[PDB]
Structures are given as structure tokens and as C-alpha cells.
């Protein structure tokens, strides 16, 4: 029936590990998370994809979230700060709202993945 443990991965290893750059860097520390977005991306359709675990039917831990344009380019990210001990599901939901908002300020249309719709 319901596992009440899974690890959901929207991204391949290649996506997770790919090198990317922001033409106009915007960065904000959101508790234990780091939010990054290229201030130069505008009027695009963007898809937020994530790797994260769940327990119960609920998001538990983010591993990594990257923002991709329709052409597959990376223009934002949410990630745990390597220094530090972890985060809760709520830090995660707040970091996402903060990123969606940042990208909408610049006239991007922002969608999230289905796994995200479902748990986050």
C-alpha cells in the first residue's frame, strides 16, 4: 500500500552535478538552505525539479532542487548548506515559495514537478 519511506528523484546525476553560472547572481540563505537564482532570466517557462525523501505521505528531507528552462538550462537551485546540520520539511516549503516568487518577479512562468505537487 503506502511505503511511508521513499526517495524521489526528478533529476539524473548529470543534472545534479552539472556546472552552471548565473549572469546576474542572486543568493539568499534561508535558514539551513541556500537559494540561488539568475537575476537575468526573464519571460521563460521554468520547471523546478527535486530529489528528496518522504516519510508518511510527507516531504522529509530535501537533497537538491534545481530550476530548469524549457531548453534544459539551470537557472536556480535550492540546496542544504554543507556546513550545517539539517532542515525540516517546512524550511523546504518556505525556500520553494521564496524561489518561485523570485523567478515570477521577472516574468517567468514557474511550474513544479509532479513529485513536488504531490508531497511538498
Amino acid at each position: 500500500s503506502v511505503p511511508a519511506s521513499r526517495y524521489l528523484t526528478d533529476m539524473t546525476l548529470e543534472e545534479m552535478s552539472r556546472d552552471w553560472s548565473m549572469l546576474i547572481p542572486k543568493q539568499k540563505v534561508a535558514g539551513p538552505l541556500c537559494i540561488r537564482m539568475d537575476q537575468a532570466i526573464m519571460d521563460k517557462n521554468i520547471i523546478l525539479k527535486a530529489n528528496f525523501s518522504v516519510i508518511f505521505d510527507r516531504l522529509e528531507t530535501l537533497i537538491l532542487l534545481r530550476a530548469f528552462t524549457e531548453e534544459g538550462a539551470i537557472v536556480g537551485e535550492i540546496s542544504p548548506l554543507p556546513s550545517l546540520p539539517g532542515h525540516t520539511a517546512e524550511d523546504v516549503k518556505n525556500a520553494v515559495g521564496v524561489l518561485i516568487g523570485g523567478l515570477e518577479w521577472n516574468d517567468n512562468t514557474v511550474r513544479v514537478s509532479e513529485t513536488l505537487q504531490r508531497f511538498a
Binding site: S5, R6, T9, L13, S17, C34, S53, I63, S79, P82
Partner: protein, 163 residues
């Protein structure tokens, strides 16, 4: 420090190999599973063919003793013992023949059920690998993200991964 970075990188290497190994172990099982699963399908099919023949034979024995009761009413008054002992002998020919194919169905079915039961064991073994597979993948992904966050480029990540 460039030492903490290589230590994590080395630790990434360890988890990735473990995950590749559990993952190969898992797929071996999956392939044995799907294979015996087809074999089971071929057995069930052969059993179905046993079933319809047996059907025919059963509804013939019941058809040759449904008239052999009323025709022990013309042959009631006798009583021959070289001829009367002979007309239920083809009733024994028919019983030994349903019995024999029953024996053969039952040996097929015994083999099928044992095989089915063996594949359920494989399914349990796989299902048992999942929590370690999941934990390992997640933990291998966290090391990778920590290395990205500390400045590792994809090429260096790929070298630690061994890809």
C-alpha cells in the same frame, strides 16, 4: 581545506560503489524473477491442457457407469464368472486411467506450486534490498551535493564516481 574535500570525495566513491553493487545484486534477482515467472506461465498452461483431457475422461467414466448400472438388470440373472467378472474389468481400465493422469497432473502441479513458492522468495529478497538501496542512493546524492556546494566541478565529481 582541500583535505576535507578529498575525504568527502573518497567517501562519495565508497557509497557509489556500494550502491552500484547493491543495484546489480537487485537486478540479478529481478531477472531470475521475471524468468521463472514465464516458466510458471508455461507450466500453468500445460496444466490447463491436462485439465481439459481429464475433464473428457471423467465425463466418460460417469457416462460408462451411468448405463452399466441399468445393464446389470438384464445381466442380473446369471451368474457367469468368466463373463460376468469381465464386464466391470473395463470399468477398472477406465479408473486406472483417470487415476494415472491425476497422478501426472498432481506431479506437474506439485512442481508448479513449489516453483511459484520459490519465486515469492526471490520477490522477498528483492523487497528486502530496497531500504538499503534507497538509503544508499540518497546518501550518495548528499555527498555529491556537498561536493558541488564546496566548489567541485562536474568533471571532478565524475572522477570520484568513477564515471
Amino acid at each position: 581545506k582541500e583535505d576535507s574535500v578529498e575525504a568527502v570525495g573518497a567517501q562519495l566513491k565508497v557509497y557509489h560503489q556500494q550502491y552500484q553493487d547493491k543495484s546489480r545484486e537487485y537486478d540479478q534477482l529481478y531477472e531470475e524473477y521475471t524468468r521463472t515467472s514465464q516458466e510458471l506461465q508455461m507450466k500453468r498452461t500445460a496444466i490447463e491442457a491436462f485439465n481439459e483431457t481429464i475433464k473428457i475422461f471423467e465425463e466418460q467414466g460417469q457416462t460408462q457407469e451411468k448405463s452399466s448400472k441399468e445393464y446389470l438388470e438384464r445381466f442380473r440373472r446369471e451368474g457367469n464368472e468368466k463373463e460376468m467378472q469381465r464386464i466391470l474389468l473395463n470399468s477398472e481400465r477406465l479408473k486406472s486411467r483417470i487415476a494415472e493422469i491425476h497422478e501426472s497432473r498432481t506431479k506437474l502441479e506439485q512442481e508448479l506450486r513449489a516453483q511459484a513458492s520459490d519465486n515469492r522468495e526471490i520477490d522477498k529478497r528483492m523487497n528486502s534490498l530496497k531500504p538499503d538501496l534507497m538509503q544508499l542512493r540518497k546518501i550518495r546524492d548528499q555527498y555529491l551535493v556537498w561536493l558541488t556546494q564546496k566548489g567541485a566541478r562536474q568533471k571532478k565529481i565524475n572522477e570520484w564516481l568513477g564515471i
